[PDB]
Design a protein around this ligand. Structure first.
Ligand SMILES: [Zn+2]
Lengths: 113, 49, 195, 1119, 98
């Protein structure tokens, strides 16, 4: 596999008007529709849903995963920031996940999985 | 001399130079093919194609 | 020629180069085809030749050698730059595979495959299709009959917006999936959106 | 006179007896390869043909190569006697297993050392050879391959002629064209400098070269004394002296090198007389000898040019310039003096498969010989053996490259048997070693009077490749030298002879050839004193019946096989006939085939020789016949079983079925058809069905070539077809891991994966729709941090990251149908797969297509059409007895296109379907005097044939239309004129005037609408150009060219053009923004700058051209 | 925006190439054989032409999205979109004039 000269893109392919091979290579990334509508609409619907939860819990999630400033706060770190204990964050996340799976939140976010 | 110059520009330059006393330039109309007319009067961007 | 240079206000020194530019890599991509068989444009080969010649020239100058070898190296570098800017414009063209000339840098512009004539040949557009035509004498002079499959695949974004608007689908992702599966709910909206 | 035992009986309007039966239609393909390899059959055929010395192709390449030796002379190797071995596997296994049908060959190499005088000999393996199957095809990597013969200008001497524009004086130019070597152009100019242009060098006087060859000046004077311009040139030359002439030649060819007599002499010998550097093929030498009439009393052994040939050429040129009609040379017979014609078929030879393969193996063997000679010059001489001296790699590489990439080795098109048979008999004038489309002039694309009987003047591509591709005529046979021949039965003294003789173009152009239609007495006496005659130069004129020398064999001698099955071709125009012949090769094999009611006699022979019908090899009795196989017990006690491939995909997606047409306990004669392949009804070609046609305009639904059909065709599956798609995915090892096929897939609902089986591939017989998963494979994944919500959901749901991605094969857009079969190859089971691949599975999807709007239909007379509408059976016009018409054709396209053969076929088809009974109680009517005695009666739905250029005359049809039998109701529907009174299917009232009705043969072309429909809104985009692009999953965009841009500019529509060129073509951010705008409520934003302009600016800057856009102020702006 | 009165073409000089290029190519290597990443000072270097992946760094020190126009001091690569890789140029320093 290491002993093959790379094929030149300018080589005519298929005699299809002798258009070079380079002309037929898809960008293979940066899909329009995916990033265009799906991703940004997921982000907006999340900003709506997670906000509809407790605002304190919304900030907790923001710091936990890093929606705003990255830096996913661990259980102990976020407890220190909020003054709580490392053991409370597990139950907080359990409550958040339970809430997210019911109501209109599920209706909105059933896709994207 | 012997260079094709568009009638409008040629006449305007002749009038400008004559107004200050410069002697007039004697020219005669000449026709040319579509290819030559296109080449003479067009942008380099459009001419390269 | 001399008057063209004189009226310019610039200098003729621009003809003799001291630093060649390199196009952005996306214009000369290096992509992996299926099977791990790399594909790249010959511009990379030409630039590699130029870089190697220049580095070797610098090494010879730093080390110091009789002027014959240095002159040969300079001549090789000149020929390398010449081959980069144009192939076949002077001397024997360079060929790597099957005696096939490499597409030089100026070759992106001239010839049937050049950029200018390719632009003169037009582009390729979205929101379009084609099909066989059959006479329809039931139509008015301002009407045409589009097959529903083509109309659905061509009007999809409008259809999906109206589909979410009517609450048939909860979100754009679900509407896109519904259009892909072509559920029976789609045809009413499609007929409604191309009024 | 059905040659085959069990042919169907279809009486014919044949008023002439053909003395010669059609030869094997694949004989051109088979005989060339038979000569190439060298087999007993070819050897005995050649011995019968009178060829004094038969030498095979392979033993003519590797015997001319030998003996290879070093310059020192101490080493010399020879190898001869090429013999093959038994094939590896049958054709069935090679096609199914993806192997290549081949057989190894061994050549005995004798190594001899001159100094020691010893010998070492043993068989030498030389790689596998791609043998040719009985159908005249090659199976390369499991795909059927056909190599098409090539038309090339034969090596020889051509005395062209050009006329001066100013002087208006004839200028005779001579050209010598070797198969390999320098070219000599002895031209005469106004300045009279008769000179040679060696290898397109500078002109030099012919006198100087002639004296440079050792030709004394006095000899020039005496031999060329009759010539005045030549004598003047001799007196004009300045340089004199053999040494001076040689040095001048050397400087002209190789200036700046040490000039010596020895060097110049060696250069001349190497350039002309050396066999390796210069060679004329045996055909070239033979043609030169015939032209100059020299060395004609002995077989050709030396194949290199000689000084006698050059002097004879110069003498011929000067004699032609003088105006001499003929010349003589010592040791030669008298020959005519006239300029040659390049397009003449006496100059264009045909290099069949044998010649092409011989050339390729010759190139490979020469490369191998170079390597071998180097190795023997370097390697030790003591312990050397030819086994360690031969290198087989280059020859096998050359053969494989030829069979893979050569432009003359093409996929065998398999729409139907006729398409393949025509493909095998093609004569392509383009390709490697031949002319190109652009460089080739338009004069070579025309017909020549020498094509009569050798190349069909009708069958030809409609596209830009018109005139560069043709087909052998039915009776043509290729000569050993490659020149095409045709049969002519000689007439000795006005009495035509039964025995035939095959004449090439030259022999034909020295004789007087009559026409087959010429009235001939039963005793061979010409009744007409003046017989139409075709003579030299294409002249046609009357001659007394004694001067005539040769006569044709059949009126169908000038037409190809495809063009020979168009009834009433003599009434159709040449372009319409060409269109019909080309469209006959696009017909799709229907589920149920039906032979035409009216069709020429070529159907059965075409079907038999196409090879798609299994034909009993030996006479016997059938023991048991099943849908799959058939076993016949031969009379000698040996049983043979024929396996009939069913629902096997063809090269173009159609299906090839072979249904047995025999019953158990039935005796079958040798050569009788046993099963019918695609497009066959009882062993005769059948590309379409018989439909009741009514010719009239109907409500504008058949307006301008459109066609109206009855729904009865759709509901009865008359025009139903089966198409089989083929998909394949492979699991290749990757650096990050090994791809695998598994039923488990990341994050997909179980319902979508229900149809898959435990191994991860769809279960056979499962309906698969568009976009459905066809085989599930998971590829290894690297490291990619998940997006916020994706990872959060993964954590919440308990679904792990499942790094492995989804790359399962899925049904492309616009595909459906059952899954008839699955074929899986595994490296574990020791299967040959490409390097880096362990598992490869291919799934076959079968789709049944019923005719629908947009599909193409066409008769045999080149009258295409698209289905405008499919009316209900109750809306179609119906005959007086209630029979609806199956199809309606407009009458405005028949007389303008001038293909009245369509209407003639309609009338004869009605007469055949209804059956007729010619009254004979009072005596045979006048119009029926020439009808065959068996053609005065026909049962209903009978089969009849009208051979091309000899069939039913107009009087015959007029008489038959008035004698058709009545229906079961006892009433005659059509009148004596062939028209009938129809009823309106909608109004219910009779049409005011009678309409033409009859049964016509309609075929279903392969331009189906399902393939044509394309649509795109947003999909993959190119990488370098960022323009729309993609596969069939997301169809690519339609090009918007400059002419479309001009059309948009003329309207004054400025915004539409701006969008079409910026916002939906190239704007990387504009596309996303507009898609956002449409999917939301907001407006479409303003377009940006195309990427095709930023790219142009960067490319132009890279050339050190300071390109910058400036405003009115002149300030540079940023982009 | 789209106010382009004129488009002129001139003869570029060495200083123009110097000041319209964002780096110098000093080695011929294109891509690493094993890790499939651009090599330093090569024909594909991120330091010269730009990051291969949007909002991503060659060394990963500033791999986070919220870093715009910040050149990573550890490797000197700017943190922007990948489309910049289609725009930025480079120049070679000829040892002798040509
Ligand atoms: Zn960094």
């Amino acid at each position: 596999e290491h002993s093959r000269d790379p094929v030149s893109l300018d080589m005519p392919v298929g005699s299809e008007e002798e258009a070079p091979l380079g002309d037929f290579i898809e960008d293979a990334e940066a899909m329009s529709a995916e990033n265009a509508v799906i991703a940004e609409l997921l982000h907006t619907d999340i900003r709506s849903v997670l906000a509809t939860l407790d605002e304190r819990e919304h900030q907790v999630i923001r710091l936990r995963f890093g929606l705003d400033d990255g830096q996913p706060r661990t259980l102990d770190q976020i407890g220190k920031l909020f003054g709580l204990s490392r053991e409370r964050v597990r139950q907080i996340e359990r409550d958040v996940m339970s809430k997210l799976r019911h109501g209109e939140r599920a209706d909105r976010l059933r896709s994207y999985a | 001399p012997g260079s094709l110059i568009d009638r409008a520009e040629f006449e305007a330059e002749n009038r400008r130079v004559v107004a200050e006393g410069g002697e007039p330039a004697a020219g005669r109309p000449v026709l040319m093919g579509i290819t030559k007319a296109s080449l003479a009067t067009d942008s380099w961007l459009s001419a390269a194609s | 020629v001399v008057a063209a240079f004189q009226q310019s206000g610039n200098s003729p020194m621009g003809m003799v180069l001291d630093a060649v530019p390199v196009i952005p890599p996306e214009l000369r991509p290096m992509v992996q085809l299926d099977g791990g068989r790399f594909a790249t444009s010959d511009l990379n080969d030409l630039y590699r030749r130029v870089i190697n010649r220049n580095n070797r020239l610098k090494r010879l100058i730093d080390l110091g050698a009789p002027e014959i070898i240095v002159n040969n190296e300079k001549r090789m570098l000149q020929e390398s730059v010449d081959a980069l800017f144009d192939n076949g414009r002077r001397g024997r063209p360079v060929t790597g595979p099957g005696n096939r000339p490499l597409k030089s840098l100026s070759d992106l512009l001239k010839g049937k495959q050049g950029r200018f004539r390719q632009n003169l040949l037009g582009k390729r557009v979205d929101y379009s299709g084609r099909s066989v035509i059959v006479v329809g004498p039931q139509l008015k002079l301002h009407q045409c009959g589009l097959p529903k499959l083509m109309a659905l695949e061509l009007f999809k974004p409008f259809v999906m917006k109206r589909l979410v608007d009517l609450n048939h689908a909860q979100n754009i992702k679900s509407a896109k999936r519904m259009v892909e599966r072509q559920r029976p709910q789609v045809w009413d909206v499609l007929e409604e959106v191309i009024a | 006179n059905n040659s085959v035992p069990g042919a169907p009986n279809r009486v014919s309007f044949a008023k002439l007896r053909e003395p010669l039966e059609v030869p094997g239609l694949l004989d051109v393909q088979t005989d060339s390869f038979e000569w190439l390899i060298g087999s007993p059959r070819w050897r005995e055929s050649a011995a019968e043909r009178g060829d004094v010395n038969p030498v095979g192709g392979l033993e003519e390449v590797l015997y001319e190569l030998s003996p290879i030796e070093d310059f020192s002379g101490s080493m010399s190797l020879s190898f001869s006697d090429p013999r093959f071995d038994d094939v590896k596997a049958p054709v069935d296994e090679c096609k199914d297993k993806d192997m290549t049908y081949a057989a190894p060959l061994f050549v005995t190499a004798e190594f001899i050392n001159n100094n020691t005088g010893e010998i070492k000999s043993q068989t030498v393996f030389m790689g596998d050879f791609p043998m040719m199957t009985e159908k005249g095809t090659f199976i390369i990597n499991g795909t059927e391959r056909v190599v098409v013969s090539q038309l090339v200008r034969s090596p020889g001497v051509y005395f062209d002629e050009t006329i001066d524009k100013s002087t208006d004086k004839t200028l005779h130019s001579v050209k010598v064209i070797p198969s390999r070597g320098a070219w000599l152009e002895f031209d005469v100019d106004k300045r009279d400098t008769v000179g040679v242009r060696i290898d397109r060098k500078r002109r030099q006087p012919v006198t100087v070269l002639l004296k440079a060859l050792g030709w004394t000046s006095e000899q020039i004077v005496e031999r060329f004394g009759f010539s005045e311009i030549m004598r003047s040139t001799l007196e004009k030359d300045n340089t004199v002296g053999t040494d001076e002439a040689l040095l001048d030649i050397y400087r002209k060819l190789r200036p700046g090198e040490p000039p010596t007599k020895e060097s110049a002499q060696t250069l001349l010998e190497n350039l002309f007389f050396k066999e390796k550097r210069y060679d004329l093929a045996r055909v070239g030498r033979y043609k030169v000898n015939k032209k100059l009439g020299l060395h004609v009393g002995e077989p050709i052994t030396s194949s290199t040019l000689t000084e006698e040939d050059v002097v004879a050429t110069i003498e011929y040129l000067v004699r032609l310039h003088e105006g001499q009609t003929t010349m003589t040379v010592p040791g030669g017979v008298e020959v005519p003096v006239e300029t040659d014609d390049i397009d003449h078929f006496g100059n264009r030879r045909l290099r069949t498969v044998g010649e092409l393969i011989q050339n390729q193996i010759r190139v490979g063997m020469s490369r191998m010989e170079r390597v071998v000679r180097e190795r023997m010059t370097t390697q030790d001489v003591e312990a050397i053996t030819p086994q360690t001296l031969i290198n087989i790699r280059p020859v096998v590489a050359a053969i494989k490259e030829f069979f893979g990439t050569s432009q003359l080795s093409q996929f065998m098109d398999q729409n139907n048997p006729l398409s393949g048979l025509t493909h095998k008999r093609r004569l392509s004038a383009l390709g490697p070693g031949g002319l190109s489309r652009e460089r080739a002039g338009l004069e070579v694309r025309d017909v020549h009077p020498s094509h009569y009987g050798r190349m069909c003047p009708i069958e030809t591509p409609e596209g830009p490749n018109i005139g560069l591709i043709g087909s052998l005529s039915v009776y043509a046979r290729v000569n050993p030298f490659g020149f095409i021949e045709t049969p002519y039965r000689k007439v000795v003294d006005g009495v035509v002879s039964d025995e035939i003789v095959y004449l090439t173009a030259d022999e034909e152009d020295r004789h007087v050839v009559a026409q087959a239609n010429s009235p001939i007495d039963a005793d061979g006496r010409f009744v007409e004193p003046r017989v139409l005659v075709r003579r030299k130069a294409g002249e046609v004129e009357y001659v007394p019946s004694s001067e005539v020398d040769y006569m044709d064999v059949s009126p169908r001698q000038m037409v190809s096989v495809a063009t020979a099955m168009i009834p009433f071709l003599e009434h159709d125009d040449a372009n319409r006939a060409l269109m019909g012949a080309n469209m006959q090769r696009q017909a799709v094999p229907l589920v149920r085939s039906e032979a035409p009611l009216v069709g020429t006699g070529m159907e059965l022979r075409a079907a038999i020789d196409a090879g798609d019908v299994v034909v009993a090899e030996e006479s016997g009795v059938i023991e048991e016949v099943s849908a799959d196989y058939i076993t016949v017990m031969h009379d000698n006690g040996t049983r043979r079983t024929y396996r009939m491939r069913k629902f096997a995909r063809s090269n173009h997606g159609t299906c090839a079925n072979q249904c047995p047409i025999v019953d158990a306990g039935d005796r079958v004669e040798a050569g009788q058809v046993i099963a019918d392949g695609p497009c066959t009804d009882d062993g005769e070609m059948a590309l379409g069905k018989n439909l009741l046609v009514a010719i009239m305009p109907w409500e504008g639904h058949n307006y301008e070539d459109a066609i109206i059909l009855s729904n009865r065709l759709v509901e009865e599956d008359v025009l139903t077809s089966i198409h089989i798609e083929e998909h394949e995915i492979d699991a290749r090892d990757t650096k990050l891991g090994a791809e695998e096929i598994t039923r488990d897939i990341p994050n997909i609902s179980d319902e979508v994966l229900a149809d898959l089986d435990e191994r991860g591939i769809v279960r056979i017989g499962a309906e698969v729709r568009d976009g459905d998963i066809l085989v599930g494979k998971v590829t290894p994944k690297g490291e990619t941090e998940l997006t916020p919500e994706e990872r959060l959901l993964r954590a919440i749901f308990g679904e792990k990251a499942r790094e492995v991605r989804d790359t399962s094969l899925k049904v492309p857009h616009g595909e459906s149908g059952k899954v008839i079969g699955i074929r899986v190859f595994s490296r574990e089971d020791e299967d040959e797969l490409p390097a880096g691949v362990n598992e490869l599975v291919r799934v076959y999807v079968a789709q049944k297509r019923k005719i629908s709007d947009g599909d193409k239909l066409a008769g045999r007379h080149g009258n295409k059409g698209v289905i405008g509408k499919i009316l209900p059976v109750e809306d179609m016009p119906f005959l007086a007895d209630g029979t609806p018409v199956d199809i309606i054709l407009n009458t405005h396209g028949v007389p303008r296109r001038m293909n009245i053969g369509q209407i003639l076929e309609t009338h004869l088809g009605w007469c055949a379907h209804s059956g007729w009974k010619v009254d004979a109680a009072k005596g045979v009517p006048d119009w029926a005097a020439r009808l065959p005695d068996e053609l005065l009666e026909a049962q209903p739905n009978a089969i009849v044939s009208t051979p091309v250029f000899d069939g039913a005359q107009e009087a015959e049809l007029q008489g038959l239309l008035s004698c058709t039998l009545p229906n079961r109701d006892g009433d005659v529907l059509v009148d004596a004129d062939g028209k009938a009174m129809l009823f309106d299917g909608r109004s219910g009232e009779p049409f005011p005037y009678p309409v033409t009705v009859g049964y016509m043969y309609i075929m279903k072309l392969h331009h189906l609408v399902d393939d044509k429909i394309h649509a795109r809104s947003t999909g993959p985009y190119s990488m370098i150009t960022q323009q729309p692009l993609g596969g069939k999953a997301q169809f690519g965009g339609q090009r918007f060219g400059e002419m479309e841009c001009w059309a948009m500019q003329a309207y004054g529509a400025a915004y539409t053009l701006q969008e079409l060129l910026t916002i939906k073509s190239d704007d990387t951010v504009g596309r996303v923004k507009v898609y956002e705008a449409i999917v939301k409520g907001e407006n479409i934003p303003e377009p940006g700058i195309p990427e095709s302009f930023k790219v142009l600016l960067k490319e132009l800057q890279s050339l050190c051209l300071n390109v910058e856009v400036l405003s009115s102020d002149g300030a540079a702006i940023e982009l | 925006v789209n106010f382009f009165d004129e488009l002129r073409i001139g003869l570029a000089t060495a200083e123009d190439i110097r000041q319209w290029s964002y780096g110098e190519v000093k080695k011929p290597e294109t891509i690493n054989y094993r890790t499939l990443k651009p090599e330093k000072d090569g024909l594909f270097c991120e330091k010269i032409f730009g990051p291969t992946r949007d909002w991503e760094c060659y060394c990963g020190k500033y791999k986070r999205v919220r870093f715009k126009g910040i050149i990573c001091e550890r490797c000197g690569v700017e943190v922007t979109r990948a489309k910049v890789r289609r725009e930025r140029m480079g120049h070679i320093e000829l040892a002798a004039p040509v």
